[PDB]
Design a protein around this ligand. Structure first.
Ligand SMILES: [K+]
Ligand SMILES: [K+]
Ligand SMILES: [K+]
Ligand SMILES: [K+]
Ligand SMILES: [K+]
Ligand SMILES: [K+]
Ligand SMILES: [Mg+2]
Ligand SMILES: [Mg+2]
Ligand SMILES: [Mg+2]
Ligand SMILES: [Mg+2]
Ligand SMILES: [Mg+2]
Ligand SMILES: [Mg+2]
Ligand SMILES: [Mg+2]
Ligand SMILES: [Mg+2]
Ligand SMILES: [Mg+2]
Ligand SMILES: [Mg+2]
Ligand SMILES: [Mg+2]
Ligand SMILES: [Mg+2]
Ligand SMILES: [Mg+2]
Ligand SMILES: [Mg+2]
Lengths: 123, 123, 55, 114, 130
RNA sequence: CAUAGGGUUUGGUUUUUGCCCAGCCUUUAGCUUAGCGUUAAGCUUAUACAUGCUAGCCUAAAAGACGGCGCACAGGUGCAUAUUUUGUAAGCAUGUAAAAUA
RNA sequence: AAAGUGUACUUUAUAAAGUCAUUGUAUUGCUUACAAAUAACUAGGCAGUUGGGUCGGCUGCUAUACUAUAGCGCCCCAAGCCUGAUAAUUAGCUAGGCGUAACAGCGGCAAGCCACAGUAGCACAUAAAAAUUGCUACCGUUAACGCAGCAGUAAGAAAGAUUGGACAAUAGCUUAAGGGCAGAUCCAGGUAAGCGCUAAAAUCUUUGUG
RNA sequence: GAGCUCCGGCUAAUUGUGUGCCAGCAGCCGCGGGAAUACACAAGGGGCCAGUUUAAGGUUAAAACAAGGCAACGGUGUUUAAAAACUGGAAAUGC
């Protein structure tokens, strides 16, 4: 650009979007489950992945993926949600933290217990 | 940033005061020319003139530094030292010692422990 | 006050020197340009005499 | 002196740009891993190297580095035709004003004179 | 700042008033350039005879009105004003007589020579002063 | 006190553009956690508030403030404010004027 | 003026002093210029609006400057003034501070300035002043109150500490009889920024025994 | 010594058993269809350490004033043109 072009607002700073807009620049958000069901992934994968529809405390509704093997989530259950995207599931951009208010940890887990909300066995 | 004041107060007095600049139970003081009615550690000053370390060192003495020329300048203008500053100037020989009034109240029997609950817990 | 008075006198002396330098430079440039104009004028006179013969 | 370059060097191999900056003895090497290995072989000990452009092909990157080193000039090139004595001198290099301000330090007194 | 300015007269429609234009520059740290800007100032004119297009000098003064806080001190250049009567006289002189190709050229050469001769004398005097 | 890159686009190569990762600084969540000394600190609500406390001292025209001095100091927050403000620079008449010392 | 003055007040076989009242060469100051985010899918804006004249603009008590901020207000007169103007969106500002070779970018700590105290209009309060001063209307609870003072409670939120001790020190208010007041402040309690040290004994540390 | 996390490549660190495009993993490229160093568990090992690993913000990994393109895609249909910026030029007439 010329000097005149630069002076008259020639350059504009690039703007980048967030990956979890529903969190409103917060690490976590509380919500209540509306529906719990399973969905199939895109090609070339094949499975029945567990997902739930959650309404956040700010009124937004998002799809959340439930990690681990098995869960006890039903409709009208309080959960805590964080960022994180499941690549093979289209439209799912959030995950449920396990071990918190209503969700429990995976039974029998021995490795990476912190990521699945399992306490250290005292016995 | 901390530009020194130039105009003299019109409705208050100038004084030479001690400013607390120590640590927990490790006092250290700085002498400055400030308005009488202000916060203790306010940034409004006319000049910083000295420093004082009240605790003894390996040599068994306390250490005190002062600008001899500027102390006279401000005393002439009308700056009024506080009671403790009068003691420092009196001992240092800048001005004659100021007499104190007679005392009758029975002195305090608990002066170094009354205000320190940690000692009282052991007591 | 004494220093200020000397500075004012120094300023006046410096200004006078600067003006003389500029005046001489301007005269030198003007003299050169006028000489060029005179040379062109002499050339034009020769062409004017030549053109009159054609008419 | 067998440890750095004579002066700043900028070379343009096809779709690659390489820059070399001399440093004081003992300062160290600031460059990518590939150039670090190349400096060890040649014996270069103190230098700063920056490479940009189309660096996908590492053959060109190495070739560009090789050619840059060959564009230096030495004080003894044709010294017989100068009629003078080219003498090595000791002059500390300087940094920019911003570096002084951030570190809270001062430049050589020869420039601060006022 | 703002004690004195030199500018051009852009409005004389007020009683003992004038508006003067000023040019100045501002430093832009990010692009390392000087940006040219303009401003308008209203000044008090006691003479009340200024002409649009004049170059004048204004100086800081006590506030006189809502938007007037300057006074005109001096005029550096007077704007040209068309005068029909003078122009008509010049036209009559131009049409009074005509010269040929040679006569006009010779007259031009003589005039330049006289101007050059006087200029040389002035230059020598300046050198003598030096 | 002075400028470091790697991965990815499936005939190969070259070239252009996009995407992801490694540092430093700051808050929460999971799992886990003995003690002592000390530095810097309390990062969402100008949402609604039980209870206790934060500014009084002195004197007296008949034992009492009605009078004097303070509350114009401290402490809290950032609603409003694009300039009303903030950060700077500049301007503002005179020997300070009277009187026999005849 | 860290001063002078008094038909004034208080203390004294010991007296120097202070208290209260009053006093300053003009008797507590206004104005201008430059810089500081987006923004044209905001193009016209202004009529007390731009300029000129008379009058007003108080709180006296040196003399002149021909009246010595100002459309700040009334009346009259002339048509001018602005035009990236006008209208919107967002934000307390400066700065310490965090990243960066720098340039640039972003805005937790100590301090300075400005604004505010449930909302709004007013009276005092000018010159250094309204959280803990009044009047009126309104909003929310119940004629009253409004914790954005310290501690503390409820709701909301991913996430916000004890209903603690002391005036011993520093700063401040009052007081000539040497005292009084204080959630400023200094200390303690609570919360895995950071920094330092301990978590094993040894001739019972030869810096010993005698 | 004591916990948290990781061991296909980027990136320091492998063997066995179970599962069989199921259950599940995943920052990126991608793993699982009966012979899995990528899923779950056991053992062994790597990193950090009273801490450790996600998530969410500021900045860097040159958005280009130092310093990018219109030659992968972008210069607009053409000309005239009293703001601004930069800055002297070769014109008119007659058979
Ligand atoms: K699992
Ligand atoms: K808040
Ligand atoms: K009094
Ligand atoms: K208000
Ligand atoms: K482009
Ligand atoms: K077209
Ligand atoms: Mg795993
Ligand atoms: Mg590079
Ligand atoms: Mg770094
Ligand atoms: Mg009194
Ligand atoms: Mg705001
Ligand atoms: Mg109010
Ligand atoms: Mg106050
Ligand atoms: Mg409230
Ligand atoms: Mg509170
Ligand atoms: Mg005291
Ligand atoms: Mg933690
Ligand atoms: Mg390896
Ligand atoms: Mg892996
Ligand atoms: Mg595995």
């Amino acid at each position: 650009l010329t000097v005149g072009q630069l002076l008259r607002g020639g350059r504009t700073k690039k703007v980048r979007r967030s990956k979890s807009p529903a969190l409103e620049q917060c690490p976590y958000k509380k919500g209540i489950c509306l529906r719990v069901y399973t969905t199939a992934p895109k090609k070339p994968n094949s499975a029945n992945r567990k997902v739930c529809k959650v309404q956040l405390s700010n009124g937004y509704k998002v799809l959340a993926y439930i990690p681990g093997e098995g869960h006890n989530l039903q409709e009208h259950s309080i959960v805590l949600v964080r960022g994180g995207r499941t690549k093979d599931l289209p439209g799912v951009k959030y995950k449920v933290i396990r071990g918190k208010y209503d969700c429990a940890g995976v039974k029998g887990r021995k490795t990476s217990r912190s990521k699945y909300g399992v306490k250290r066995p005292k016995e | 940033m901390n530009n020194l004041l130039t105009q003299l107060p019109k409705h208050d007095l100038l004084k030479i005061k001690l400013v607390r600049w120590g640590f927990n139970k490790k006092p250290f003081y700085v002498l400055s020319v400030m308005k009488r009615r202000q916060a203790r550690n306010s940034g409004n000053r006319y000049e910083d003139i000295g420093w004082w370390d009240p605790s003894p060192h390996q040599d068994g003495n306390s250490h005190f530094g002062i600008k001899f020329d500027r102390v006279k300048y401000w005393l002439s203008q009308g700056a009024v030292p506080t009671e403790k500053v009068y003691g420092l100037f009196g001992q240092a020989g800048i001005i004659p010692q100021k007499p104190a009034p007679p005392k009758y109240k029975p002195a305090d029997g608990n002066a170094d422990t009354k205000w320190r609950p940690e000692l009282q817990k052991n007591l | 006050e004494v220093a200020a008075e000397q500075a004012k006198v120094a300023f006046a002396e410096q200004k006078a020197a600067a003006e003389h330098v500029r005046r001489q430079a301007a005269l030198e440039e003007l003299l050169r340009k006028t000489e060029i104009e005179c040379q062109l004028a002499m050339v034009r006179v020769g062409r004017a005499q030549k053109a009159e013969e054609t008419g | 002196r067998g440890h750095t370059v004579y002066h700043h060097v900028e070379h343009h191999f096809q779709r690659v740009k390489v820059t070399l900056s001399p440093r004081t003895s003992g300062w160290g090497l600031r460059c990518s891993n590939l150039f670090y290995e190349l400096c060890s072989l040649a014996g270069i000990r103190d230098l700063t190297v920056d490479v940009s452009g189309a660096t996908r092909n590492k053959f060109f990157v190495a070739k560009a580095f090789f050619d840059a080193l060959q564009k230096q000039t030495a004080p003894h090139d044709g010294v017989e035709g100068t009629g003078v004595y080219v003498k090595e001198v000791v002059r500390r290099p300087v940094v920019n004003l911003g570096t002084y301000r951030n570190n809270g330090t001062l430049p050589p007194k020869e420039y601060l004179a006022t | 700042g703002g004690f004195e300015f030199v500018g051009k007269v852009v409005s004389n429609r007020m009683q003992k008033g004038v508006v003067v234009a000023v040019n100045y520059v501002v430093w832009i740290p990010k692009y390392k350039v000087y940006e040219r800007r303009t401003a308008r100032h209203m000044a008090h004119d006691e003479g009340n005879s200024c002409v649009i297009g004049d170059i004048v000098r204004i100086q800081q003064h006590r506030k006189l009105s809502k938007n007037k806080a300057y006074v005109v001190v001096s005029t550096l250049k007077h704007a040209d004003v068309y005068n029909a009567k003078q122009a008509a006289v010049l036209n009559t002189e131009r049409s009074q007589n005509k010269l040929g190709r040679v006569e006009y050229a010779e007259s031009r050469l003589s005039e330049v020579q006289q101007r050059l001769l006087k200029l040389r004398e002035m230059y020598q005097k300046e050198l003598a002063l030096n």
